[PDB]
Amino acid sequence: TNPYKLMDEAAQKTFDRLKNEQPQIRANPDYLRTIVDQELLPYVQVKYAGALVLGQYYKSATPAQREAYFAAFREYLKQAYGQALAMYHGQTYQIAPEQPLGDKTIVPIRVTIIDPNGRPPVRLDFQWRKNSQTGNWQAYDMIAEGVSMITTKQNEWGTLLRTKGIDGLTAQLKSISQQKITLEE
Numbered sequence: 001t002n003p004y005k006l007m008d009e010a011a012q013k014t015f016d017r018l019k020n021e022q023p024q025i026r027a028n029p030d031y032l033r034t035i036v037d038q039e040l041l042p043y044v045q046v047k048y049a050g051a052l053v054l055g056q057y058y059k060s061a062t063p064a065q066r067e068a069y070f071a072a073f074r075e076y077l078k079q080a081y082g083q084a085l086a087m088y089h090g091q092t093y094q095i096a097p098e099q100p101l102g103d104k105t106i107v108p109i110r111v112t113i114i115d116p117n118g119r120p121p122v123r124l125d126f127q128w129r130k131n132s133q134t135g136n137w138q139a140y141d142m143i144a145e146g147v148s149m150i151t152t153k154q155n156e157w158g159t160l161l162r163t164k165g166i167d168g169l170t171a172q173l174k175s176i177s178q179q180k181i182t183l184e185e
């Protein structure tokens with residue numbers, strides 16, 4: 001279980017479904033949520049990325065609040081990444097070539113989304129951590145062009161956390177995950 005292979009398998013499998021399952025996506029755009037759930041989330045440290053988004057506000061949550069938060073957060077990943085896969089129009093991808101890992105516990109792995117018409121590339125640095133029990137590698141952030149998504153969400157949900165706490169943020173996640181995914185034509 002090595003992050004460069006996993007990064008590449010996740011990518012291969014996602015692109016395959018996006019190319020070959022247009023009928024399913026067009027019959028029901030929320031079917032993108034499946035492609036995210038089956039091809040991308042198995043490699044995502046969903047609790048850890050959820051907890052990082054909470055920061056200070058993790059310590060204060062009851063187990064009940066945390067489990068309701070994480071459930072909401074996974075639904076919210078499927079919806080949000082689903083809505084991003086709605087931007088597919090026959091892009092291809094490139095992976096950073098494998099480095100040796102040595103003793104490193106964090107590794108950034110770039111996937112360049114490549115436009116078929118030679119429009120500008122999108123550089124996504126996926127952040128992989130070695131799990132400290134199992135040794136397995138999982139993604140826990142995405143740096144889109146220069147910017148951490150996790151930091152982007154800390155900043156954007158910070159008032160909602162100061163005003164309404166985890167419960168407020170869990171209500172907003174559930175709310176967004178109920179938005180039907182929309183397709184460009």
Ligand SMILES: CCCCCCCCCCCCCCCC(=O)OC[C@H](COP(=O)(O)OCCN)OC(=O)CCCCCCCCCCCCCCC
Pocket residue numbers: 007010011014040041043044049077080081084085087088089091111113122126139140141142144149150153
């Ligand atoms: C590896 C396979 C990659 C798939 C790419 C397929 C190509 C399809 C074409 C579309 C181009 C892709 C880039 C879209 C532009 C963009 O980055 O934005 C896509 C959007 C940002 O946009 P927004 O303003 O809607 O944010 C507002 C949306 N709420 O991020 C998101 O979902 C944000 C969600 C991130 C939440 C916290 C971060 C958790 C990190 C966990 C890591 C998960 C994946 C790990 C997998 C191993």
